[PDB]
């Protein structure tokens, strides 16, 4: 498929520096939906400001984890049913920490923002479309952790 290669070639650019790009994703995320900030509860404390999250080593590890799951999705872009059972339980885990299904779209928008900023003119509307579909497939799998 032409979509698969668009994903692989765009990801190649981002996967070079995953924390720097991930940090973009999350900064954007908290700008769009500040109420996601309290869900990160390392040492039973809440971040006061988005910038506090950026000084937490656990938070930065979580960014790395995010980027690793996306990398796995990219690698399996030709068949994402292989990740399905993992993504479902990943969904369940996030449901447990207090993530809401409706916040998936914010994460998606954040992902697209990060790609748009990173690729600039290379972020064509076909790249956009490809990534939306990839992201959608991921969310559909994770969503089964709410079962339904
Ligand atoms: C954007 C909102 C999200 C929030 C608020 C959030 C929050 C959390 C929290 C609180 C944990 C548990 C503590 C920790 O491991 O750092 C966690 C774990 C995790 N998150 Fe997220 N997360 C989000 C999104 C994502 C997304 C989109 C992915 C992947 C695509 C991701 C991948 C992971 C992974 C792999 C773990 C470790 C799960 C385990 O095996 O226990 N997270 N997340």
From Swiss-Prot:
Predominantly expressed in brain. PROSITE patterns: GLOBIN (PS01033). Changing residue 62 to L: Improved binding of dioxygen and carbon monoxide to the iron atom. Its EC number is 1.7.-.-. It is found in: Cytoplasm, Cytosol; Mitochondrion matrix. It holds the Pfam family Globin. Phosphorylated during hypoxia by ERK1/ERK2. Phosphorylation regulates the heme pocket hexacoordination preventing the association of His-62 with the heme metal center. Thereby, promotes the access of dioxygen and nitrite to the heme and stimulates the nitrite reductase activity. Phosphorylation during hypoxia is stabilized by 14-3-3 proteins. One of its GO terms (molecular function) is oxygen binding. Heme b binds at residues 62, 94. Induction: Up-regulated upon oxygen-glucose deprivation. The keyword Heme applies. Belongs to the globin family. Monomer. Homodimer and homotetramer; disulfide-linked. Mainly monomeric but also detected as part of homodimers and homotetramers. Interacts with 14-3-3 proteins; regulates the phosphorylation of NGB. Could interact (ferrous form) with G-alpha(i) proteins (GTP-bound form). PANTHER family: BLR2807 PROTEIN, NEUROGLOBIN. This is Neuroglobin. It comes from Mus musculus.
